[PDB]
Structures are given as structure tokens and as C-alpha cells.
Design a protein around this ligand. Structure first.
Ligand SMILES: *[C@@H]1O[C@H](CO)[C@@H](O[C@@H]2O[C@H](CO)[C@@H](O)[C@H](O)[C@H]2NC(C)=O)[C@H](O)[C@H]1NC(C)=O
Ligand SMILES: *[C@@H]1O[C@H](CO)[C@@H](O)[C@H](O)[C@H]1NC(C)=O
Ligand SMILES: *[C@@H]1O[C@H](CO)[C@@H](O)[C@H](O)[C@H]1NC(C)=O
Ligand SMILES: *[C@@H]1O[C@H](CO)[C@@H](O)[C@H](O)[C@H]1NC(C)=O
Length: 153
């Protein structure tokens, strides 16, 4: 009934929600841009981030699990599903004054979902949690069997 979660290492994680699998990475680089890419204001805006209808519930579940407040928190950014390059849904957790409180909350959520998670975000620098759906070109090689066989799925 809940999505299944896997931790590969401190930067690479996976979620399985029904038939869909998602690559979740913690990193210090983003190629998304507010007012160019899509701002995810409400849960149903996730439909503009993902080509599969049955994927939105799982991403929403994960957002709630991390502590995202849909009404009040900074909107997630995502790449529009009309782009062939593939899904890229992003939480900005930077240790910088504008996103500081939010990032702390989201890292606490990561810690609660993956007890082995340690904080890799540097003070005054950018830091992100980024999700790509397996099977989109934006997942590159990382949903191959040589990766996923390390997860329980
Ligand atoms: C993620 O959040 C960080 C922190 O708010 C953003 O970086 C800041 O952007 C503002 C607005 O342009 C700058 O004035 C600050 O100097 C930046 N701070 C740092 C530490 O870089 C960053 O742009 C956000 N990322 C995305 C993709 O929107
Ligand atoms: C986790 O594994 C990926 C894929 O092999 C690798 O690229 C990445 O650097 C690893 N992360 C850490 C923190 O070792
Ligand atoms: C996504 O891109 C299409 C064009 O490719 C555009 O018509 C649509 O408004 C975009 N959606 C969002 C939410 O920006
Ligand atoms: C999503 O589907 C639309 C329409 O079929 C297409 O333009 C786009 O390339 C697809 N995106 C991905 C990431 O598969």
C-alpha cells in the first residue's frame, strides 16, 4: 500500500510506486530555472511533470513524507513533460537563507525515510533532491538491472 524505498548510497535512492520506479538523487547541481521550467504549486500540477498518469500519486506521497507543505512551502520545480529529455522534479534544500528552514525540514524527512542518509549540503551553496522517472532519458543508465538488483523490489 505504501511505495517501496531503497537506498543505494548517500546520494542515490529509489522509490517504487506500483509499476513505476523513480531515481532520487541528492546533489549540488541543478539545470532547472524558476520562470523557465514548471512551478508545481498544487499536487495536480505534477501532471505537467510526468507523462504517465499513474506516477503523480507516488511523487505526491514522497513529497508529503518529506514534510512538504503544499499550501505554504516553496513550489517544487520540474521539467515540462513536453520535453523529450525527460522528467526532472526538484526540491531546493540549499543551506542559504531563503531556503534554509525548508531545506532543514526536507533533510529531516529524508533522514526519517532513509535512516542512513547523512547531510551532504554545504553552507551557503546550492543543494537539491532531484527525481527522474525510470524509463525516461533523464534516468540515463541508473535504472538498469545492475543498479536495481541492489534494491528489494
Ligand atoms: C535554490 O535556492 C538557492 C538559495 O535560495 C538559490 O540560490 C540563490 O538565488 C538567489 C536569487 O537569484 C541569489 O540572489 C542567491 O545568491 C543564491 N544563493 C546561493 C547560495 O546560490 C538557487 O537559485 C535555487 N535553485 C533553483 C534551481 O532555483
Ligand atoms: C552512489 O552511486 C552512484 C552510481 O554508482 C555514484 O555515481 C555516486 O557517486 C554514489 N554516491 C556516493 C555518495 O558514493
Ligand atoms: C508545457 O509546454 C507546452 C509546450 O510544449 C506548453 O504549451 C504548456 O503550457 C507547458 N506547460 C506548463 C505547465 O508550463
Ligand atoms: C511526453 O509525451 C509527449 C507527447 O506524446 C512528448 O512530446 C514528450 O516527448 C514526452 N516526454 C517524455 C519525457 O517522454
Amino acid at each position: 500500500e505504501l511505495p517501496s524505498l531503497c537506498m543505494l548510497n548517500n546520494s542515490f535512492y529509489y522509490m517504487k510506486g506500483g509499476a513505476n520506479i523513480f531515481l532520487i538523487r541528492v546533489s549540488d547541481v541543478s539545470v532547472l530555472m524558476k520562470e523557465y521550467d514548471v512551478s508545481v504549486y498544487e499536487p495536480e500540477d505534477l501532471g505537467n511533470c510526468l507523462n504517465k498518469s499513474d506516477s503523480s500519486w507516488a511523487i505526491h506521497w514522497f513529497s508529503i513524507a518529506l514534510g512538504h507543505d503544499w499550501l505554504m512551502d516553496p513550489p517544487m520545480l520540474c521539467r515540462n513533460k513536453t520535453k523529450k529529455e525527460g522528467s526532472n522534479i526538484q526540491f531546493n534544500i540549499s543551506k542559504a537563507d531563503e531556503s534554509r528552514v525548508y531545506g532543514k525540514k526536507i533533510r529531516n524527512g529524508m533522514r526519517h525515510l532513509f535512516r542512513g542518509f547523512y547531510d551532504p549540503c554545504e553552507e551557503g551553496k546550492v543543494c537539491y533532491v532531484t527525481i527522474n522517472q525510470c524509463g525516461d532519458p533523464s534516468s540515463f543508465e541508473y535504472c538498469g538491472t545492475n543498479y536495481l538488483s541492489k534494491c528489494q523490489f
